[PDB]
Amino acid sequence: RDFNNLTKGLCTINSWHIYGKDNAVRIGEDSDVLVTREPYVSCDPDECRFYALSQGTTIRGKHSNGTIHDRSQYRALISWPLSSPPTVYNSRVECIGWSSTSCHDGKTRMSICISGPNNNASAVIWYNRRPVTEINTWARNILRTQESECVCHNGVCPVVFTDGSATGPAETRIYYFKEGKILKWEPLAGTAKHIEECSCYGERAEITCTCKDNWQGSNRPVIRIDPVAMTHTSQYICSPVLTDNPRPNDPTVGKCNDPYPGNNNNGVKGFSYLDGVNTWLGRTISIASRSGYEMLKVPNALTDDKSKPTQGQTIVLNTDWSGYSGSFMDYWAEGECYRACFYVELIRGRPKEDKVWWTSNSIVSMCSSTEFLGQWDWPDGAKIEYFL
Amino acid sequence: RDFNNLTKGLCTINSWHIYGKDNAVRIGEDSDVLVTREPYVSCDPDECRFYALSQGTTIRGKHSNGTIHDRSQYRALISWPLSSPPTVYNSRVECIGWSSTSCHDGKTRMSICISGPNNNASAVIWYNRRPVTEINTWARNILRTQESECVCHNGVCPVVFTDGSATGPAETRIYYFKEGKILKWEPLAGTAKHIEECSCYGERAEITCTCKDNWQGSNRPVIRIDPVAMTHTSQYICSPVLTDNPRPNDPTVGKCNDPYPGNNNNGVKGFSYLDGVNTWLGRTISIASRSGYEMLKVPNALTDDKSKPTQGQTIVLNTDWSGYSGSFMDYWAEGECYRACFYVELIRGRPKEDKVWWTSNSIVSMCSSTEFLGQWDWPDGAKIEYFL
Amino acid sequence: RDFNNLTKGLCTINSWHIYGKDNAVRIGEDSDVLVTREPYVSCDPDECRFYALSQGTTIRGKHSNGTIHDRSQYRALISWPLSSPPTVYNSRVECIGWSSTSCHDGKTRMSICISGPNNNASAVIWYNRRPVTEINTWARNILRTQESECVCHNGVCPVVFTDGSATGPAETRIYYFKEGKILKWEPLAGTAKHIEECSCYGERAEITCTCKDNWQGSNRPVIRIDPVAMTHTSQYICSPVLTDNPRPNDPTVGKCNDPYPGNNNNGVKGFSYLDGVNTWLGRTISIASRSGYEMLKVPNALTDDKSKPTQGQTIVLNTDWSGYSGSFMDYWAEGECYRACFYVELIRGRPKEDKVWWTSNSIVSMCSSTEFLGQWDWPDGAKIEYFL
Amino acid sequence: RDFNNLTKGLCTINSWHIYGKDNAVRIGEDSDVLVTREPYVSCDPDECRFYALSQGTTIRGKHSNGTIHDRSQYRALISWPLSSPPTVYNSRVECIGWSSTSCHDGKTRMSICISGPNNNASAVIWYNRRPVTEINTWARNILRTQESECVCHNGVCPVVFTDGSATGPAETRIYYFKEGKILKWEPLAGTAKHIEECSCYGERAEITCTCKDNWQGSNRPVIRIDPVAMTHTSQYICSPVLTDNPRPNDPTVGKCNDPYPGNNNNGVKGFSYLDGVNTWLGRTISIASRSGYEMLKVPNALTDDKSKPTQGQTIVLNTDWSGYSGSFMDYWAEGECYRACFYVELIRGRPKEDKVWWTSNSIVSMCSSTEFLGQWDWPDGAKIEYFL
Ligand SMILES: *[C@@H]1O[C@H](CO)[C@@H](O[C@@H]2O[C@H](CO)[C@@H](O[C@@H]3O[C@H](CO[C@H]4O[C@H](CO)[C@@H](O)[C@H](O)[C@@H]4O)[C@@H](O)[C@H](O[C@H]4O[C@H](CO)[C@@H](O)[C@H](O)[C@@H]4O[C@H]4O[C@H](CO)[C@@H](O)[C@H](O)[C@@H]4O[C@H]4O[C@H](CO)[C@@H](O)[C@H](O)[C@@H]4O)[C@@H]3O)[C@H](O)[C@H]2NC(C)=O)[C@H](O)[C@H]1NC(C)=O
Ligand SMILES: *[C@@H]1O[C@H](CO)[C@@H](O[C@@H]2O[C@H](CO)[C@@H](O[C@@H]3O[C@H](CO[C@H]4O[C@H](CO)[C@@H](O)[C@H](O)[C@@H]4O)[C@@H](O)[C@H](O[C@H]4O[C@H](CO)[C@@H](O)[C@H](O)[C@@H]4O[C@H]4O[C@H](CO)[C@@H](O)[C@H](O)[C@@H]4O[C@H]4O[C@H](CO)[C@@H](O)[C@H](O)[C@@H]4O)[C@@H]3O)[C@H](O)[C@H]2NC(C)=O)[C@H](O)[C@H]1NC(C)=O
Ligand SMILES: *[C@@H]1O[C@H](CO)[C@@H](O[C@@H]2O[C@H](CO)[C@@H](O[C@@H]3O[C@H](CO[C@H]4O[C@H](CO)[C@@H](O)[C@H](O)[C@@H]4O)[C@@H](O)[C@H](O[C@H]4O[C@H](CO)[C@@H](O)[C@H](O)[C@@H]4O[C@H]4O[C@H](CO)[C@@H](O)[C@H](O)[C@@H]4O[C@H]4O[C@H](CO)[C@@H](O)[C@H](O)[C@@H]4O)[C@@H]3O)[C@H](O)[C@H]2NC(C)=O)[C@H](O)[C@H]1NC(C)=O
Ligand SMILES: *[C@@H]1O[C@H](CO)[C@@H](O[C@@H]2O[C@H](CO)[C@@H](O[C@@H]3O[C@H](CO[C@H]4O[C@H](CO)[C@@H](O)[C@H](O)[C@@H]4O)[C@@H](O)[C@H](O[C@H]4O[C@H](CO)[C@@H](O)[C@H](O)[C@@H]4O[C@H]4O[C@H](CO)[C@@H](O)[C@H](O)[C@@H]4O[C@H]4O[C@H](CO)[C@@H](O)[C@H](O)[C@@H]4O)[C@@H]3O)[C@H](O)[C@H]2NC(C)=O)[C@H](O)[C@H]1NC(C)=O
Ligand SMILES: *[C@@H]1O[C@H](CO)[C@@H](O[C@@H]2O[C@H](CO)[C@@H](O)[C@H](O)[C@H]2NC(C)=O)[C@H](O)[C@H]1NC(C)=O
Ligand SMILES: *[C@@H]1O[C@H](CO)[C@@H](O[C@@H]2O[C@H](CO)[C@@H](O)[C@H](O)[C@H]2NC(C)=O)[C@H](O)[C@H]1NC(C)=O
Ligand SMILES: CC(=O)N[C@H]1[C@H]([C@H](O)[C@H](O)CO)OC(C(=O)O)=C[C@@H]1O
Ligand SMILES: CC(=O)N[C@H]1[C@H]([C@H](O)[C@H](O)CO)OC(C(=O)O)=C[C@@H]1O
Ligand SMILES: CC(=O)N[C@H]1[C@H]([C@H](O)[C@H](O)CO)OC(C(=O)O)=C[C@@H]1O
Ligand SMILES: CC(=O)N[C@H]1[C@H]([C@H](O)[C@H](O)CO)OC(C(=O)O)=C[C@@H]1O
Ligand SMILES: *[C@@H]1O[C@H](CO)[C@@H](O)[C@H](O)[C@H]1NC(C)=O
Ligand SMILES: [Ca+2]
Ligand SMILES: [Ca+2]
Numbered sequence A, B, C, D: 001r002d003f004n005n006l007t008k009g010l011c012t013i014n015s016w017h018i019y020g021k022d023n024a025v026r027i028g029e030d031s032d033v034l035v036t037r038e039p040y041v042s043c044d045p046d047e048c049r050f051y052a053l054s055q056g057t058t059i060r061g062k063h064s065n066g067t068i069h070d071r072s073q074y075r076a077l078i079s080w081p082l083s084s085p086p087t088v089y090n091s092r093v094e095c096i097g098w099s100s101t102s103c104h105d106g107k108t109r110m111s112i113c114i115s116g117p118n119n120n121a122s123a124v125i126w127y128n129r130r131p132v133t134e135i136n137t138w139a140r141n142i143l144r145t146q147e148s149e150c151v152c153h154n155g156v157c158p159v160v161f162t163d164g165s166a167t168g169p170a171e172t173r174i175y176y177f178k179e180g181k182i183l184k185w186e187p188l189a190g191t192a193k194h195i196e197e198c199s200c201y202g203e204r205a206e207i208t209c210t211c212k213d214n215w216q217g218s219n220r221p222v223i224r225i226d227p228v229a230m231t232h233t234s235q236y237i238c239s240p241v242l243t244d245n246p247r248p249n250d251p252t253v254g255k256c257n258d259p260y261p262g263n264n265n266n267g268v269k270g271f272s273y274l275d276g277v278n279t280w281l282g283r284t285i286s287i288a289s290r291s292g293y294e295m296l297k298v299p300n301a302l303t304d305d306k307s308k309p310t311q312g313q314t315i316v317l318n319t320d321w322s323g324y325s326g327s328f329m330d331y332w333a334e335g336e337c338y339r340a341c342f343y344v345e346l347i348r349g350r351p352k353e354d355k356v357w358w359t360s361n362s363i364v365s366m367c368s369s370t371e372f373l374g375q376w377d378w379p380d381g382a383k384i385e386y387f388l
């Protein structure tokens, strides 16, 4: 109809309720479920769907051997009905590639997939299911993007890309698309020293992205975008409650404009909702591996370098595997506020479970409630032994 | 379009004709059919579909081992086309959880799923396929609901929930929802001493629910709801034709306001159509187990404590497994009256058939006919030996 | 929109072109294809689909054992996209039962399924996918119907049913339905001595049905219906070109008003297009079994007791299995005439191929061409040995 | 809506970006994927889909044995969602046959399938999913057509057919259809000596077809059609950059009006975009087999007999199997020009990989970019050893 505008603020997050879970690995043990990773969720005005990067093979298929690798010519961004598993028969291909983002602007959807060899990748921007724009690698070192939904405002949908080193300074760019065409792009500015895999959400005409500093930071870089002025800023979440993985133990004071040190060249895609006292941070429970997952209410985390938790909710037990996590919201829901949502990628197989030769995942997702709901843990649920 | 209003009375039930049967277990022996239980049927203005609680695994899948359990993080309310089986590829997830209800109000559908640990469950009310309201457990003991469709009138859709003991007094509540929001809720009143799994239907602006007294009653509790005044009453079916399971042998006089004794802490979800002389009761044939199923015309069963059958129809032979049963009607059909319908859950596997490690079911459903039709029996049809 | 009216005459049939073929048995050797029999084709204003009676199990499934039987509680009328196979995932259940018919009246579709024990069967008439009318057995001996599409004219859709003996006089009735309700029914009149499984088509406000005399006739009975007056007549195809199976060898003179003798208590569903010189008869090539299939142009077959072929076309070689055949036309096609079409059921398995324990079929269908096209034979294509 | 008119010219081709890839063989190793060959892509105003000739069996199915053969009664033209594999459950049959073409005219789609024995084949032209016209073989020797999409202009959709010898002069005809009816047909004229499997595209009211001279030419014949005048011309691509396969090594001067000699009675379906300096030729890398694939920018290839490459892009490495290739464009895309696209059939199995008894393929397709994008190679990706 008309382009969606981020006119509402976030609903008050008093807890998280179960939104979707596909139990893909469990079901895939005996049905045609595609091997995936880097999943996310994204809504259209009339439907919300699961998204992920297929590996172009089923889990039980012999070609599942080797799927621990991130980039091949057999990957593609696929979407499928909410809470169903990604099957060969119900998965809709959005585009071909090994890194992606996607978002609906209110009229139609834009999907972006990057493909290529490490030194010669290119992104192709699809809009209304047709290819419209292409962007060649600018740093010749694994052009890559969000791995979760982008956000639009009055037709303008900003997207963060990074090209260059994962263990040193790289060239991050913010592109402002409208109907799949480039209106403008900026180099990263602000104090964030390294950016990768931004998780974004929008409220009151501002887009907030919680990303990952793979190079040096255990605290997360944050990019705030003004989609009208098409400008942005960057800093780190000040809070001592560190949210990347692996990471050192939490200090009593964090860092607002530099990566919090202790762990180099590694990390995991994550997210947060930074809204004053209505601030919630997600993170793995383990400081060493992609294990467990919890939500922590940390009032003013973005700006308070001594902020600590005032409430919390466990999503996945530390005795269960987690993985990537990101933000999305149904911008077309009823009501006066936007209900914060997120998903957690539940990785199974390699490298942690090496008795099988594949790597895949399932998805679990929650949205906020103004109630103070009881909590449950949500594991993948599959028994690896069954796949042996 | 406009909210549906219960303006018609029930059609005269002279017999029951076959409406739907999915033969899920038979078909699932060699195709990707999800393990389920607690099924039901519910109509939209343009389509009627089967519903059930998936166990998040196929029947042949190795994860089917252990599905005798009722509550896990891998269950979800799913719906699928009438008479098809619930397959991985055609099942649409309505919400995540281990207890549910769902109903269309004429404009859109409301679905409710409860999830959580036993002492910290919560219900989330979805409307127009989006989460709208959440209700935290109030008695911290397995918050649970109908396991069959709710009914709406002018946008108001009452739903019965129970939280607390299954073997002693519990806290039952009647919630009146409109567009997924809570208009009001009441504590259970009347003479019903324990309520669980209500099967409801509506006619002439009144909603009748036949539930189950798990604690003490072998006769069924009945809740009658006025969806305009948003008030209700409760009592038991007076009739000596006892309809819970297990149960003692039929007496010559029943009980109108107390549970009929003889069997404690057990029962099965069931239903009835209480409409004066046009009254029909469903029940298992066996008084000891979920075996067989029959419909008995018992004029004035609700109010006559000596009422006995005047007609009957066998649905499932006592030599075949049955299970839960419930009511639904197509409120959007043509004609001057509402055609009473019901389904019977045909449970296969554990605990009765323990040579397999799973528990699932198939569905059979009938609707009334003004004709006096010949009868057939409708078993699940699968051979357990094939699964060994 | 508006009810369809049979305003056109038949197109001139100069040959037959390939219309659809699902290769169900071939494909079903390694995919989830349902076991079926008694198939047919029927069109809606916007789509034409394959129909058949499922056996409630896949071909490879262990429950395929025993599918040679005609009536069980696991059968149902299903439809699926033209030329696809009937799979668990794409088959839409129209109704439950073991004998059926279905037709679109221009506004919506009417489907009829009969179920029950032999002595207590009943038909339920669905319209706009909802049950509307029920008819109890009148002779208590396998109430049964067409097994191919019915035809409508201005909302009136006549259907032929038979109840009673298959080897002696039975009670055949012609029901005239409108919106699933009974307007009127007649007992069979005319000279046809026994009627079963009528194949019908309509042109210029008249409905012609070529049926089968199971009791005594090797020539086919024909019922011509006036859907406005709601009256009919019956006789036999006069032609010496005999079209039932099994049958004796062709004589030089046929019978117009009595069954042509030589074979009792047996037969196969078949069809014909009786249109003066534009008359074509279908039949198995073998006089002993459901083997092979050919179309023969026999000018004035209905009324000329010495009529013999003037042209022909082989559909299935005598070295391949055939089965039932019936008529259908796309009444919503463009042009000035109705294009005659038919299907042939290609039966595989029992009783002819007893190395497997199942019985199923695939479908092949053709429509007429005003051209004189070259001919090909169209076998099922599956190798039974593969199923061993 | 209205018939589409070829009002735009081609976009400038500076490189090729990835458009679609189904990884069918990889996925089909463990899911119900149909065996195919002769694939292509074609767009409707609201969707673009993959097309191919099914072999009526899955790859893992026992009936895959023997699929190296081109013509059987079990083949059919099927289409399925872009980049999904052709599965039993998602493939839509367009028509029955072993040679095809299909194109949308802006209002609806026309599909053509040819079937029959070698000496008695016939084509049936479907429009709006209904059979409308039939054409009997005129030379009684494998009537055959494009194997890729046709193109329409103001309702007129020309199609090239060939009937007769593959190793000597044959009878090629250009049919001009409108709404599935024949407006006119011409015999081939011009200097092309033999025509088969034309790959066509349209721009500025002209339709260009790059075909194959199986008899004698290693350069490709080209037919240019005026769809308004319903006339055409024919010649060969003048360029010394030879594009058929097998072929001799490239000379320094080609042939404009005769086949370039060196290889007889063989070839592969291919294509090109002939647009002055914006000219690109596709071809296998190997001169001996269907191995590898590359795009070469050869300015004025059609008319310059000494034209050589000025730019290039590898699509498939010479160490990977290729096959047929053809042209298509989304005529309903936004913008001022038509974006050239093509697909490459990636053949697996026989005859090159004879350890398996089947022959199938997967699809990869690209479209042009005005950017100078980095290149990647796109192999089928399946491991034959897994199928052993
Ligand atoms: C039914 O459901 C309800 C609803 O969920 C249940 O109630 C919930 O119960 C939760 C568990 O108790 C509770 O969650 C905790 O909340 C704490 C905040 O509340 C408390 O403090 C505030 C502020 O003073 C008070 O107002 C309030 O009254 C409470 O006293 C959080 O602090 C908790 O998180 C910390 O603990 C968990 C372990 O439980 C860690 O995983 C987590 O990371 C936090 O601790 C780490 O991080 C902090 C900050 O840096 C460190 O200081 C601390 O030492 C820990 O650091 C180590 O561990 C991390 C992580 O591994 C590592 O990185 C670091 O290096 C160190 O090694 C927790 O979030 C809910 O808020 C509460 N909800 C409600 C509405 O009540 C109820 O129990 C259920 N009923 C039953 C019967 O089960
Ligand atoms: C073709 O199709 C037609 C249509 O279906 C067939 O006709 C039907 O035939 C049915 C079977 O006969 C018949 O069903 C029965 O109807 C009885 C009521 O009718 C009779 O009584 C009335 C009232 O006086 C008369 O007007 C009428 O003319 C008849 O005489 C019911 O009473 C029957 O139910 C009882 O019996 C069955 C066993 O058959 C039990 O399963 C059932 O539970 C009922 O009996 C138990 O319960 C009562 C009440 O408390 C007890 O008194 C009794 O002792 C039994 O109790 C024990 O068993 C229960 C259950 O296990 C247990 O809980 C308890 O503790 C005890 O242990 C039955 O419903 C249809 O009405 C009839 N329909 C029509 C339209 O005619 C026709 O036969 C078919 N043709 C062929 C050729 O097959
Ligand atoms: C390319 O394609 C074209 C198009 O299809 C091919 O041309 C077609 O060729 C067909 C085969 O020749 C031909 O079909 C036959 O047509 C005959 C009618 O035409 C002839 O007679 C007329 C009338 O005088 C002439 O005008 C005309 O010019 C011809 O001379 C039919 O009579 C044929 O059917 C009979 O034979 C077949 C066996 O071929 C039987 O299966 C069939 O049942 C018919 O014969 C039985 O029945 C009759 C009637 O009672 C009996 O008299 C006879 O003895 C047989 O009876 C026995 O068998 C039956 C069946 O088993 C059994 O029940 C009975 O008891 C007995 O045991 C046949 O239909 C097409 O018309 C023709 N089409 C065109 C447009 O030309 C061309 O060949 C192809 N090219 C190549 C290179 O292959
Ligand atoms: C990142 O991505 C970018 C973008 O893709 C990469 O840059 C691309 O690099 C490509 C590879 O170098 C390049 O492709 C070549 O382009 C040549 C044309 O450009 C050159 O000449 C022009 C004209 O003078 C200059 O303007 C220009 O500056 C260049 O100097 C083509 O000529 C190339 O094709 C020929 O070579 C390949 C092998 O590489 C053959 O497969 C191909 O068939 C061509 O050669 C055969 O055919 C010709 C013509 O008849 C014969 O003369 C020749 O001898 C060969 O013949 C044999 O082989 C054929 C085929 O088997 C057989 O039939 C025959 O009988 C003989 O046996 C090639 O197309 C892209 O244009 C370039 N793109 C851009 C925008 O720059 C970049 O490298 C990537 N980065 C990294 C780090 O990898
Ligand atoms: C059910 O009853 C309500 C009246 O209570 C109907 O509601 C009215 O509908 C019309 C048409 O939309 C409006 O003009 C009225 O204001 C509506 N509501 C009320 C609450 O007054 C409703 O249309 C009825 N449903 C149907 C299917 O007729
Ligand atoms: C089939 O014939 C009937 C006439 O018998 C047509 O019915 C009339 O349709 C128009 C338009 O809906 C109405 O105004 C008349 O009252 C209708 N019916 C009768 C019974 O008079 C019908 O439209 C015809 N079908 C088509 C497709 O033209
Ligand atoms: C484009 C790409 O390769 N992204 C990969 C990403 C990347 O390697 C890291 O961000 C350092 O740049 O790492 C991971 C990961 O699970 O850790 C998965 C992604 O597939
Ligand atoms: C929420 C829940 O657990 N419901 C379970 C219900 C419950 O245990 C009983 O009603 C006593 O409360 O019992 C049964 C049952 O087949 O008997 C199945 C349900 O899954
Ligand atoms: C309702 C029913 O049973 N129809 C059966 C029919 C019937 O037995 C015969 O018409 C004598 O009445 O026979 C056959 C058959 O392949 O021969 C199949 C049908 O399933
Ligand atoms: C109608 C038909 O058979 N076409 C076949 C075609 C043909 O044989 C050749 O064009 C000589 O005429 O060859 C090939 C091929 O892979 O080479 C595949 C096609 O299936
Ligand atoms: C099929 O059923 C028959 C009859 O019960 C049995 O003897 C036979 O062995 C079965 N065959 C198979 C393969 O199950
Ligand atoms: Ca880091
Ligand atoms: Ca399978």
Ligand SMILES: [Ca+2]
Pocket (backbone or CB within 6 Å): B212, B213, B214, B215, B216, B217, B218, B244, B245, B263, B265, B266, B267, B268
């Ligand atoms: Ca009880």
Ligand SMILES: [Ca+2]
Pocket (backbone or CB within 6 Å): C212, C213, C214, C215, C216, C217, C218, C244, C245, C263, C265, C266, C267, C268
């Ligand atoms: Ca007979």
Ligand SMILES: [Ca+2]
Pocket (backbone or CB within 6 Å): D212, D213, D214, D215, D216, D217, D218, D244, D245, D263, D265, D266, D267, D268
């Ligand atoms: Ca050649």
